[PDB]
Every structure is written in C-alpha cells, then in structure tokens.
C-alpha cells in the first residue's frame, strides 16, 4: 500500500485512539461470550503482528477477542487503544496460554522487565520495553486503563499454566 494511503489510515487510528474513554470496562475475553472498529488497520483481516523474540514468538494480531480469533493468533481487546503507539495510549493484546498446536503466549511468564517486544502494523514496527508484570483476577481487567501521557502495550494471558484461574499482564512502554 502506498505511503499516502498508509498515513491517512494511521491518522484515522490516531483519531480513534484520541476518542477513547480513558476508562473502559474491559471484560475478561476468555470467560465471556464481526468487528469493524479497526478496519483502517486491516490487511487481509490482520491488524498487525506481535513479536517477543525473548521467547521466540511472532504471531498475527486480529480485531476483537472472539474465539475464532484466539484460535489463530492474538486478539486486540476492544476498548483499548489500537496498536499504533502515541502518548496516552494503552493497547491490550491477548492470547491463549498455549493451544494444542501453537505456543502463542505459553511462555509469556518467562518475559522479564527490560526485555523488548515489537508490534508491527501497516506503517511501522513499534518497540516496547517491559516495565511491569502483574497477576490479577479475571474480573479485574478494567484497571488496565489508558494512562495520560504514556504509550503502553499490555500483553495478556491466563495463569498459572494449565490452571488459568488468573490473568497475567505484561506491560511494555514505548521506546522513543
Ligand atoms: Ca465494530
């Protein structure tokens, strides 16, 4: 796609991000029951890719967290910022703590503070440095709000392994 088209679409994503309420009510995607909100970012139905070389993961990102999406890649939590970076953005990307055939976020618990993951979209590849690692009740995801003046992406999965009673949140902060 041509540069001028990419920039218009990114401008749309930014406008969307700057419209978001800073205080979503995020419901646990794993225990809950077709999305157009991220159409500007979509190429063949994917909005991006998330790579965590620290653990050998590189998987596609799709809009929403339907079970169809989570079977095949990472799902973007609607109500959070779209993964294009910027101040006052906080995107949440979700994936299973492993599937039969796919590692997905199986080893997210092995990511450490200071390590760097990458989110690639139609425009560029963004780098995020891990700054926090937390475990919370599934019924507590709303806290994962957009923080004024910060550019964050949280990677979200279930824990402990093979139990999945709780949720692991690994938050990275934009490296400018
Ligand atoms: Ca929609």
Cβ neighbour number for residue 62 with a 10 Å cutoff: 23
Name the residue among 138, 47, 134 with its Cα closest to residue 93: 47
CATH superfamily assigned to domain 1-176: Sortase (2.40.260.10)
Expressed in angstroms and rounded, the spacing between residue 110 Cα and the centre of ligand 1 is: 34
Q: 16 C-alpha to center of ligand 1: Å?
A: 12
Q: Where are the domains of the chain?
A: 1-176
Cα dist from 57 to 33, 73, 106, whole Å: 27, 11, 9
Elucidation method? X-ray
State how far the Cα of 99 lies from the Cα of 102, in Å rounded to an integer. 5
- What is the resolution in angstroms? 1.8
158 is catalytic: yes
What spatial distance separates the first Cα and last Cα of the chain, rounded to whole Å?
25
Cβ-contact 124, 176 below 8 angstroms: no
49 is catalytic: no
Q: How far is CA 106 from the centre of its chain?
A: 15
Give the DSSP H/E element, type plus range, for residue 7. Answer: helix 3-17
User: Which residue is listed with tokens 């910027």?
Assistant: 86
Active-site choice (44, 49, 76, 96): 96
The rounded Å distance from CA 63 to ligand 1 centre is 9
- Which residues make up the environment of ion ligand 1, defined by Cβ < 5 Å? 35-37
Pairing, β 74-76 against β 57-63: parallel
Q: Report the 10 Å Cβ neighbour count for 74.
A: 29
């Amino acid at each position: 796609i041509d540069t001028n088209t990419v920039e218009r679409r990114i401008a749309l994503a930014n406008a969307y991000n700057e419209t978001l309420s800073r205080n979503p009510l995020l419901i646990d995607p794993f225990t809950s029951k077709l999305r157009e909100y991220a159409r500007m970012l979509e190429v063949h139905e994917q909005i991006g890719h998330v790579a965590i070389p620290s653990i050998g993961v590189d998987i596609p990102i799709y809009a929403g967290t339907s079970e169809t999406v989570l079977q095949k890649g990472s799902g973007h939590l609607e109500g959070t910022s779209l993964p294009v970076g910027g101040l006052s953005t906080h995107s949440v990307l979700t994936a299973h703590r492993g599937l039969p055939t796919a590692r997905l976020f199986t080893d997210l618990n092995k990511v450490k503070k200071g390590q760097i993951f990458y989110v690639t979209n139609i425009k560029e590849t963004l780098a995020y440095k891990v700054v926090s690692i937390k475990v919370v009740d599934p019924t507590a995801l709303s806290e994962v709000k957009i923080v004024n003046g910060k550019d964050y992406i949280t990677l979200l999965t279930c824990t402990p392994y093979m139990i999945n009673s709780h949720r692991l949140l690994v938050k990275g902060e934009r490296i400018p």
